[PDB]
Amino acid sequence: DLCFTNVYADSFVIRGDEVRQIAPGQTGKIADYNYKLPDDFTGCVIAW
Amino acid sequence: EVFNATRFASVYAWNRKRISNCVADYSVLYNSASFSTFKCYGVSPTKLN
Numbered sequence: 174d175l176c177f178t179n180v181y182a183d184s185f186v187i188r189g190d191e192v193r194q195i196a197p198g199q200t201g202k203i204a205d206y207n208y209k210l211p212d213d214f215t216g217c218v219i220a221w
Numbered sequence: 222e223v224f225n226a227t228r229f230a231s232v233y234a235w236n237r238k239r240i241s242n243c244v245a246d247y248s249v250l251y252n253s254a255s256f257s258t259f260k261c262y263g264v265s266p267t268k269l270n
């Protein structure tokens with residue numbers, strides 16, 4: 174029921190154990206050196 | 222001595238080890254240690270450094 178303004182899809186491949194690191198306030202190898210989400214992140218993270 | 226231990230203890234006899242006088246540079250675990258679960262309760266992870 175919503176319309177989205179600036180839709181950006183960031184795609185990558187990580188380990189199964191590093192999926193939890195894709196979050197606004199996580200630490201770790203991926204979260205620190207590879208891909209960091211903003212604290213005020215508005216969106217959805219999908220992993221399969 | 223903690224995450225690379227050859228033998229771990231049973232859950233009913235869980236081992237407790239004191240950590241003192243050291244620098245908790247956990248980034249050294251990035252090379253070889255992959256953790257399925259890492260949940261911090263009383264502190265935000267990003268402030269751990």
Ligand SMILES: CCCCC/C=C\C/C=C\CCCCCCCC(=O)O
Nearest residue numbers: 200201202223240245247256259269
């Ligand atoms: C030898 C134990 C020293 C403990 C010192 C006390 C607090 C320091 C905190 C956290 C260290 C463990 C981090 C494990 C997860 C790394 C990041 C990840 O992979 O997601």
